[PDB]
Amino acid sequence: MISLIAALAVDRVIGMENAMPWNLPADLAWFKRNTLDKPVIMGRHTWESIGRPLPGRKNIILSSQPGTDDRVTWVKSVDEAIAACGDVPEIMVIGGGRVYEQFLPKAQKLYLTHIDAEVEGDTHFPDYEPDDWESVFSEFHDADAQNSHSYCFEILERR
Numbered sequence: 001m002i003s004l005i006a007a008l009a010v011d012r013v014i015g016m017e018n019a020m021p022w023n024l025p026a027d028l029a030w031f032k033r034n035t036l037d038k039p040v041i042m043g044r045h046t047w048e049s050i051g052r053p054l055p056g057r058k059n060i061i062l063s064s065q066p067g068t069d070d071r072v073t074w075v076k077s078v079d080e081a082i083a084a085c086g087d088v089p090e091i092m093v094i095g096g097g098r099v100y101e102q103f104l105p106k107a108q109k110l111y112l113t114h115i116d117a118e119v120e121g122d123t124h125f126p127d128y129e130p131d132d133w134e135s136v137f138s139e140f141h142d143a144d145a146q147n148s149h150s151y152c153f154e155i156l157e158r159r
C-alpha cells in the first residue's frame, strides 16, 4: 500500500524545512512515528534538502540522473521505486511536488498536517477530490510553547 505524508499550509502550499515559517516539533514526532521502519520515497529536491538519509527507514531517491551518494537507493522511475521497496505493507511518499503528483493516483492513504498559516510558495500539493477520500482520523491542536501555529493531523483513506 502506498502512502503520502505531507504538511500543508493555507492553499495547499508545501515547502522545505528552512522554507518553512513554522516550528512544529509535534508535526515532527508525527512524521517520525508514521514513517519509521518503512521505506520512504522522495524526489531529488527533497533529498538535497534533507542532506542525510533518514535513520531507520530505507531511503529511495527518485531522480533521472545517476546518484551521487551511496548511503541511499537511487531509482529512475515510479515503477522502479516501487519495486526497490519489495514486499512491505506500506510505502511512504515524502515529496516533493512532482513526486506527490505522480504517486497520488497510486496511493490509498493520506497523512496530512494542515498548518494554519499563510505563506507565499512556489509549490503545492495536488488538488485531490474529497469525494474520493474518506477522513478516518483527525486531531486539531492549538499552538503552544513548542508549536508556533495551530495544526491538524488528518488521515484519509481512498474510497
Ligand SMILES: Nc1nc(=O)c2c([nH]1)NC[C@H](CCc1ccc(C(=O)N[C@@H](CCC(=O)O)C(=O)O)cc1)C2
Residues within 6 Å of the ligand: 005, 006, 007, 017, 027, 028, 029, 030, 031, 032, 050, 054, 055, 094, 095, 112, 113
Ligand atoms: N507531516 C509532514 N511534515 C513535514 O514537515 C513534511 C512532510 N510530512 N512530508 C514531507 C516533508 C519531509 C521533510 C522532513 C525534513 C526533515 C525530517 C527529519 O529530520 N525528521 C526526523 C525528525 C527529528 C525529530 O523527530 O526530532 C526523523 O527522524 O524523521 C523529516 C522530514 C515535510
